[model samples]
Target: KDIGIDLGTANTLVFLRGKGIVVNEPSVIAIDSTTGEILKVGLEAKNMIGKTPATIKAIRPMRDGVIADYTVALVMLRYFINKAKGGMNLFKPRVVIGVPIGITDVERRAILDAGLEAGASKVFLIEEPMAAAIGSNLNVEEPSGNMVVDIGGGTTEVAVISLGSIVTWESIRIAGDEMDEAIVQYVRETYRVAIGERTAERVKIEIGNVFPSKENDELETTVSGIDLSTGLPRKLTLKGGEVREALRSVVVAIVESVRTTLEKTPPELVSDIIERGIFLTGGGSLLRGLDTLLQKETGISVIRSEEPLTAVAKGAGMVLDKVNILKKLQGAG
Candidate 1:
């Protein structure tokens, strides 16, 4: 059996070659720092964060789409690989891992080693944007340039691809996490309450938008948090308008990344991009009216992928069928 893994900062989605995706969970780990043991991983690990004792810590081993603690990341990967293999761990299966762009060789090596340590017979690496484009069914082997913007949890990757390679790209750390953080920050300053955990994310997804909308301005969500001035519990109703500026600030950085990549694109590709439009993928793409905001910013259409969240994992799995292409893709780095 072959498997593909989208080892993202916020979530990890594993795709089994014949069965599609099998495991989808947060890329989080809970460890007993004192005993140097992993107590939990994935969803359980993420759920334990902010509710654990001092010795028990929930860790996001992969932060900003890169491995933070090598051993911890290795443990997490092994857990995912084992879980994906299920009871049929007869053979050491080949695996394809979707990695971020613009990482150093040392950083890249960590992923390769992690794959092997996680029970992979052989590991193939594919850039996330290329995997994303392929997963969305884009023709990457063609001569025409097509852009894919992946606004993921910890990082945003913008790439212009042609002939199965990235011609121009920009990777920034300001992405979904910043979007969540901004909302959390807004509520603390605007409402004078200390909102922690996932409420900010809920508020963001509920009524978040990049552009101005009267309808969005009126929508409200309930946010409960601790009061900053007083240490007691606080509840407040938040309107979308109150957090628009914060969301827009993160959106501007994403837009600028796309703008920079376009400026560096070849003139021939620019013409093709104008017609093909910029493609959007990942959770950030789900933001209301983001397509319109990107289109208005770049004077081009912004098309969201049909399966935005699973695109990378699917693309990673698809490459396992074409071993030559997978080999060549690894060397392309």
Candidate 2:
């Protein structure tokens, strides 16, 4: 069997050959504290994030494109691997997993060990930018320069590709996680109300916008949390524009990183990038008017890839369909 996995910090996506994307789930796990057993994994575990009882712990095992908790991450991987293989997985599958460009050797080793523990016969690590570029349908094998900015949950990967090679790149540890934290902090300081990670993420998806449209209308979401003053449960209504304000700093940081990369790009590659335009892929691209904001800041055209969120998994799937391609890409890395 052959499979591809986008082992991201915020989410996990799996692609099985001939089956398209088989699994898309939060990189969350709920474990029983006393028994040392997994209570639930994926979306179910995500639901337990802030609502779990005292005896149960809900946590994201992956953090910043690396596994923060090795045992938990491996168990989660094993579940997905078995699920991808189905009943006919007599032999372990050769798996290709995505990683951030700047991961250290120790981090890479941890990933390899986790995958092997999860039943992979052979493991291949491909940088996230490369997988996203291929998945976004850019002809990376060509000589033309192509830039792909993949702003996933935990990391933002920016890379310039020409002839299947990374010419210049930057990886920032600021993305969806930061956005969520922004909301959390903003609410705590401004409203005197506290929220959980899930609630903060909900605020981002529902109302957070870096740049709004001309007809951008305000939206309100009522959240339940603790009131700091009273030390009691409370619910408060949060507006869309307010969410935008909370997310501004993080968004600006992402743009600045892009600008920094562009400044360092070679002259010839800059010409290619200007001609081809910049491409944005990942869950964060779905932010309101992000492409337009990037365009204004960089003075370069920005295009959002189709699907936005599933590009990496789909790209991984494509490589699984052609094992030789994976081998070549891995060798180049």
Candidate 3:
């Protein structure tokens, strides 16, 4: 059985040909450093973050949508692949993986090599923007242009697709992770408290917003962190307005990138984009008011995919059964 994988920086998703999405897990692993044993993976591993013992470390092998630890990433892939195949290692299935558009040749080869090492019969790479468009149900094969913005954990990928290939595109290494970091920085500066990455991520999901409204400004949540001055645990309330301020630069950068891509697009395709509107996908696209922010900035309608997080993986799965589409995407690498 063939599989389509979204080897995302924040999370990994596996979609089997006929089974839809079969595995969705954090892109994390917990290992015993002394013995070189993998203690846990996925949700279990993620839970160990900022809480693991001295002998064990929980880590994400992927950084900015590329493999940072080749051996660990390969092992993680093999585990997921084995699980997808139901522990039946008899057949080495073909695999299609979605990758960031701006990845270098070396990074691209790493994915291919990792897949091969993980027991794939063959592997093909597809750009995340294209996969997201397809997964969001955009008609990329049509002659008209379709614009897609995939805001993943590590990168924000924007592209205009015409005839199933990228026409104009921009990939920036700033997205959800950056927003989380911004929140951490904000809290440390203003509250004099040091928060872990996971805590910052929690705040981003709980109270984060780019477009400010009175209701959003009034929203508040309690956060716990280590007090810089007191050297003890401290609990403080964080306002949504403050979180918005923390994320302002990042949100603005993303919007500007979208504008830049639009400016460079051909006039006719720009017309198509204005008519069809921009489609948003990936985990970062789910940010509370990003669509509104984009619409306000570009003066064009913005649409978010229903399943923003799984769009890339779903698109890759869709390609698995289409011989013509798969063949057409074969040269994408």
Candidate 4:
């Protein structure tokens, strides 16, 4: 058996070699602090984020694409591993995991250790940008150059890949998590209401954008939260323009990173990028108008991958069976 895993800070996605993507679960665990027992994990655990009891805490063990709480992370991985194989398979699965481009040796070891502790027979790592490049169907083995930006929950990966290798790259910790925090801060300051992380995330998905549209065009959604000063329940209407303003800084940082990578890219590959445009993958790429915003900022065209959300995991899955391609792509270890 073989499977590819995208063990992200915010979400976990699984791809089986012949079954396509098998599981997509929140990277969350609910635990009883006093009893030292796990109460729930995955979707159920995620739902407890803002509603848990005093004794129970819901947490994400992975932060900024690395393990923050090893014990809970190992439990989460083990649960997913069992679920991936229907609790029992004839053999342990050979696993390939996608990691960030600029991860350190410590981070790499942590990921490998987590996988091994969770029951993987063997483990391999693939850089997220390289995996995204393959998942986006931009032939990395080709002599021509291709650039990819994978903006996920924890980190944003930018790379100039050609001939199955990254010539230049950058990884920034500021991405979806920062954007969510921005929304919370903005709403608290403007409306004096304190919303949960999930609500802030909803606001971003429903009305967030990097660029503004006509004044006549606006999206409105009801935001409910507790009053920051009075501790009373409150609800208010949030607009698309307002959410955009809150997330402006985060959006700027991501686009600026892209520009920086482009400036450092080789001239020959830069020409190919100009012709083929840029590929955007991961959850953040789905943000409204991000592609358009990038295209306007840089003369080069920017387009989102066909399935931006799972591109990295799909690419990781592809490498499980294609050892030649994986080795050639520097995913052997």
Best by TM-score: 3
Q: Order the candidates by lDDT, highest first — what do you get?
A: 3, 1, 4, 2
lDDT (tens digit, per residue) of candidate 4 on 70-179: 88889888888888887865567878888888788888888888888788877888999888877777888788878898998899989988887889888999888888
- Model 1 agreement with the true structure over 1-333: per-residue lDDT tens digits: 888899998899999988898999999889897997989988888888777888998988887888888998998899899899984465777888988897778888888888888778888889889899888889887899899999888889999999878899999888888888999898888878988657788888888877789987887889998998888899989887776777877888889999999999999999999999999999767888889889998999989899998999999999766655676865221
- The per-residue C-alpha lDDT of model 3 at residue 6 equals 94
175 Cα displacement, candidate 3 (Å): 0.7
Model 3, C-alpha of 260: deviation from truth (Å): 0.9
1-333, model 2: which lDDT tens digit per residue?
667789888889988878678888988888888887988888998888878788999878888888899998999899888877774455788888999998888898889888887888888888888888777788887888898999998898899988777889999889888889999999999989989888998887887777865443466788789999899999989887788788889888889989999999999999999988999998866778789899999999999888777778777767655554565644211
Q: What's model 3's TM-score?
A: 0.97
Two-way TM-score contest, 2 vs 3, winner = 3
User: TM-score of each candidate?
Assistant: 0.94, 0.94, 0.97, 0.95
Number of the top candidate by lDDT?
3
For model 2 the local lDDT of residue 100 reads: 90
TM-score of 1: 0.94
Q: Model-by-model lDDT, in order?
A: 0.86, 0.84, 0.88, 0.85
**Model 2 regions more than 4 Å off:** 87-90, 212-214, 320-325, 328-333
lDDT at 101, model 1: 93
Report lDDT (Cα) of residue 88, candidate 2. 41
Candidate 2 residue 220 C-alpha distance from true site, Å: 2.5
lDDT (Cα, tens digit) per residue for candidate 3, span 14-116 = 9898878998999998999898798998999999999988999898898787889999999999888888888856789889999888999999889999989
Give the winner by TM-score: 1 or 4. Answer: 4
Count the clashes in each prediction.
Answer: 0, 0, 0, 0
Superposed Cα deviation of residue 88, candidate 3 (Å): 4.8
